[PDB]
Motif scaffolding. Structure first.
Motif: not given
Ligand SMILES: [Mg+2]
Ligand SMILES: O=P(O)(O)OC[C@H]1O[C@](O)(COP(=O)(O)O)[C@@H](O)[C@@H]1O
Ligand SMILES: O=P(O)(O)OC[C@H]1O[C@](O)(COP(=O)(O)O)[C@@H](O)[C@@H]1O
Ligand SMILES: [Mg+2]
Ligand SMILES: [Mg+2]
Lengths: 518, 518, 518
Positions: C62, C64, C100-101, C230
């Protein structure tokens, strides 16, 4: 488009799903009953009023805790909250009271100089379980007293024992006289008077103890509407519950809580003996592997739908709302899919009994159920319920399925049904119309009990009996019309279906009229 | 186990077929209407009386033959035969009168009496065709007259001319101003005034000739219940007949005969224009290849069923019974399959007009139809009729589909409907209940026109109109109850569905009752 | 009976449910892909080996959070764990890596000092939102910093602002140029760097930020298998992600995350541009009303199934398992229902990234998926998938549907498919056989990406290409056989279905053989 109208008309279930539309608002009416467990967070008259406004239909009193006095005072509060709305009979909402049995629970004793705190068990640490009542309130990390005196007969070397919603597991290593030595298979914080499960043990506790009969007799004196009977294993358990209610308790509904392997295995005889079923998922998923619970849920919901008996889906539906103002995405999905499977009622437990957001929990159930009810593939459901139901010669049953068919045909705002005992209305509910079933009755308990059935919006007529019976029948229909109008179920020009009997009887419903709402 | 009930509960059509049983007796009621063509074998009061006793519902008069005086007498005999039964209102059968139009037929002239009987047409012989009226009654092997004046305009060297139910064929070898020289492709015996077909030649005969206008007007005068209009090719054709039928003919049902390529091709407009359809297979099977007729038959039946409009299957259903007291195996299967496809009525032509076994043919049709009606797969048919039908606001429509649904649910003895115009009953019939629909009416035309709809057993009330409207209603209901009891449709044991209205209107049917038969 | 085979044979979905059986054991194979988010709890080589053993198929990173360096280490550990099983080719499992962006997220800043840690927002309190970078790491109950510099351009007085999984809510009392004053409506405790949502605001952050560009390029050099993008709002967003990936990252699958109202609305365009979809419920149920999420989930799964493109169900599936060793009953239900809906893969977030029981969360998902796969109503699903597919094709689509049919007819142990790029195994997946699809490939990226499709158990063949094609085919087939046998999918006597090209080629998989296993 509204009511998932575009999706309702798909030739396949697949295409139906493709057409589900987030921006298509549902109808006002909500069909699925909402049952709420009342406890310290929701007991006050004032919050109880908000709960009724938010959608609560049934108050559940869990007799696993509290006292007759405590629960009597809760029931009184439910009744004050409920009756505070009787000044306006067009908007008054009947509220049922349900007595939830303790049953054959196994509990642990008290933690040393209690409740001065709790203990910690560790994986690999060993634990002695004793039956010796010396230790009754001397439980610490080394010894634990349990209240089930025959535990040693029923378990063996290797047996698993789950404690406290099954979060802790022990394994019997040394068996022994009247005590057990175990290794903590799975550790955690251990508190006082926690539930014990013995999956796969031949547990011999009765479904109905002396103390259960005293609770039940209390319920009859307190004039409750229904009984949720815990740990039912066979039909004969259901019969004991009913007989013990005696003549005074004759019309109380018996709901069997299915929550162990034997219950599932004997589901059919239990269903035949009961007025309805509760899928008690809490104990059920400790008693059998958790991966299997959705199977038992869908099984039971199918069979109750096929039999026309109410089924309640229960336990942890919105658990995280005990602590938080919104549910998890799992919880939102769980409530929705229970509705989509066919549950007549959904239940809240800790989330209304003790949580910090009882009101938000109730609203959420209301909001989800009504989106899910619009999402139902009525095309296939109605067809399947027809096929699978027997030819009979009961004219009420024939009038009921005829009315549901008419309702689909003209897309009506409601089915209005006059009913003394509930039955005519329950008969309509069985065929799962999309339109709400407005059940007009004078019997107040009938009104309260009608909440067990998907779709039945019960309404209590207060008007005195006319002496022209035809005029009395009309007063009631017009009453149902004013309620629908006031609640927004339908407008002045809409059409509705009205079911009526030929004589003032008691079981003669047999007439169906399709009328515009005045 | 009676009326193919084991088969009725199967989940696939294939299993349903497997479970059809030769020892399972059908119900008393027979739902498919029987139309008999009346002529020399069937025209006397005595034999007409036996035909009614035998199941005849509609008397067809074919105006390709006879004079007005001849037909007036036939109608008068029909009425006399029908009224002979009026002295017992319970056992009386209304009988409808149908007028079958000549339309744009082409026919040959009269063979030379000599009295040779018939002329032998030999393969490869030449045959002159003339339009010169001096030969109108002098037809033979060398010269054939035809009454279609334009023929020479519309064929070319090599064209094919079909004579006598398409059994004889000629090829045009030479063209003339008012004659044709042809060669016999298909030989045979030629008799007098035979039908000629010119498939895919561009026939310019009007749909409604001066003779047809005359006949239609006489039908109005004579008060016929319906007209079978021949060779309808388009909706505007139907409009002519309706025009020519005018206001006094307000209520005469127009039934359009589909019998050429265009009629099939433009079928949807003709169906929307007409009150009903006849699949006119005789000509149809000469105008298109004969292996294709069953395809036309089954699309027209399908679409009329989907539209809720009466369709009639006609022509050579039991042809061989013209000479024989028992039909061919293909004839028994043909009749059974027409019912099974959904035909409202089946028709007999020569078998009742001129045959030696008019009464056996009628009985045979009654016998096969009742057997086939028990073998219909209603599970599927009812489900498909519902899917395909639109959601309306018409309370009568809602009521009708509700009554049929109830009728399946309690295995009803009949659906009793009070109707003045017939609509309420037509609306029940389009959903294809198995149970007979006993339509009670005081209007005699309505009771005759009812025969056009599968399963409507019209019943004519003669009783005085009671003072109180509710008691008048009840009277009509008791009437129907008695007639069904009288005829063995049902006993005090059973249940029937009664449809009724909320006011002595005239289109307000909105009430269904489910009633054990007193 | 095993495998819910009794339920499989039901004529109605209702009866199917009725027959669902707790005691009917499932097959050994589990078809639904398992995606696990790697984080502090799961990142060590030793934990990752156990995750692969417990059932992990895809490791999710992830972006993020974390630095590139951090992620490169996680990736290297995932590969060390995966490659440690390569010494037994029979038991090796390909493991995909997904990036996962971050996307156009809005986050709060860091709390405290001086905080300490949490900070209690009070229902009724007033909270100022600032954009001044001085407060970036100084947040508390009075002052909160956000990293969305245009927030002020885009909310209004009385707009709602949600913080931390939508658990805290704020209403804007006063606007201003670079600050907002607000009132806490749902309080709670606010941690650092929480997600912010502005539902019904036109947030104007770019689809692909500079940071996303840098993350995607990093994805290309690390050779990841797939990208979860995302907050995809529309097709041009997906096209932007594709441009960054460029020629070099051509084969990387792009899965669009649908998590806002515009994504649901423009779903069809997004799906056409994408290689699959993730239903990202966390943000989605804050952006739209939480009651509605189940509707969007089911519409997206249906439409992805109908398009034959992978769909993932994400977020809070076994949430309570972050701190507990067993999930709630809502959690177990949610997983089953996702698989029953038609989801290709299921996902775990915090429960494997940061919780106390990552291995048990994987195992539980594995256990429920497989239970739910036996409960699917294959009889209806297959009928519907065939009806919704075109009656067109394409020998390869015909062979695949023929293969899936043979597979039901004989309760095949597997369908073995030989594929270079995955496509032929993809085709079989879209028809949803119950038997596992063992896809044999020599392309390691194909083997890793295969986990996106329900039922595809990829198997990576490492042997060199044999001299004769026919022996090359048998080598790969026999290898599938051994893997199946070693895993308990089937044995010596069973039958498998094998799919193959006719010529030494690639695609054009037009050959199906039904073979007993040696
Ligand atoms: Mg993300
Ligand atoms: O649903 P139940 O208990 O059979 O009661 C239905 C009865 O209610 C009625 O509609 C009205 O009867 P009452 O006026 O006695 O309440 C009857 O005609 C019918 O038999
Ligand atoms: O089928 P139709 O022609 O609409 O007639 C049905 C009508 O017959 C009735 O049942 C009886 O009416 P009458 O007393 O006018 O015959 C009406 O209530 C109803 O509207
Ligand atoms: Mg209890
Ligand atoms: Mg004629």
């Amino acid at each position: 488009q509204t009511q998932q109208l575009h999706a309702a008309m798909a030739d396949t279930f697949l295409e139906h799903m493709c057409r589900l539309d987030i921006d298509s608002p549902p109808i006002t009416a909500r069909n699925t009953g909402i049952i709420c467990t009342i406890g310290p967070a929701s007991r006050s008259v004032e919050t109880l009023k908000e709960m009724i406004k938010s959608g609560m239909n049934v108050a559940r009193l869990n007799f696993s805790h509290g006292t007759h006095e405590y629960h009597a005072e809760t029931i009184k509060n439910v009744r004050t909250a409920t009756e505070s709305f009787a000044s306006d009979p067009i908007l008054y909402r009947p509220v049922a009271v349900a007595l939830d049995t303790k049953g054959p629970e196994i509990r642990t004793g008290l933690i040393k100089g209690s409740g001065t705190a709790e203990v910690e068990l560790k994986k690999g640490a060993t634990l002695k379980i004793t039956l010796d009542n010396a230790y009754m309130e001397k439980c610490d990390e080394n010894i634990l007293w349990l209240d089930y005196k025959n535990i040693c007969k029923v378990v063996e070397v290797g047996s698993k024992i789950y404690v406290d919603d099954g979060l802790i597991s022990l394994q019997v290593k040394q068996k022994g006289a009247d005590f057990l030595v175990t290794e903590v298979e799975n550790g955690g914080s251990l508190g006082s008077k926690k539930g014990v499960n013995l999956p796969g043990a031949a547990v011999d506790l009765p479904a109905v103890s002396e103390k259960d009969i005293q609770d039940l007799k209390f319920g009859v004196e307190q004039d409750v509407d229904m009984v949720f009977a815990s740990f039912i294993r066979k039909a004969s358990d259901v019969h004991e519950v009913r007989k013990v209610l005696g003549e005074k308790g004759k019309n109380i509904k018996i709901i069997s809580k299915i929550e162990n392997h034997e219950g599932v295995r004997r589901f059919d005889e239990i269903l035949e003996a009961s007025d309805g079923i509760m899928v008690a998922r809490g104990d059920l998923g400790i008693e059998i592997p958790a991966e299997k619970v959705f199977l038992a849920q869908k099984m039971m919901i199918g069979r109750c739908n096929r039999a026309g008996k109410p089924v309640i889906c229960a336990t942890q539906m919105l658990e995280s709302m005990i602590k938080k103002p919104r549910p998890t995405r799992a919880e939102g999905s769980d409530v929705a899919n229970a509705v989509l499977d066919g549950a007549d009622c959904i239940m809240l437990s800790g989330e209304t009994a003790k949580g910090d957001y009882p009101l938000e929990a109730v609203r959420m159930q209301h909001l989800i159920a009504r989106e899910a009810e619009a999402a139902i593939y009525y095309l296939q459901l109605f067809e399947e319920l027809r096929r699978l139901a027997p030819i009979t010669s009961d004219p009420t049953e024939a009038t009921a399925v005829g009315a549901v068919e008419a309702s689909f045909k003209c897309c009506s705002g409601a089915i209005i049904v006059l009913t003394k005992s509930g039955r005519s209305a329950h008969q309509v509910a069985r065929y799962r119309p999309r339109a709400p079933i407005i059940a007009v009755t004078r019997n107040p308990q009938t009104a309260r009990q009608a909440h067990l059935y998907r779709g039945i919006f019960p309404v209590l007529c207060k008007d005195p009996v006319q002496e022209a019976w035809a005029e009395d029948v009309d007063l009631r229909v017009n009453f149902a019309m004013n309620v629908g109008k006031a609640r927004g179920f339908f407008k002045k020009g809409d059409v509705v279906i009205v079911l009526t009997g030929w004589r003032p009887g008691s079981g003669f419903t047999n007439t169906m009229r399709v009328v515009p709402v005045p």
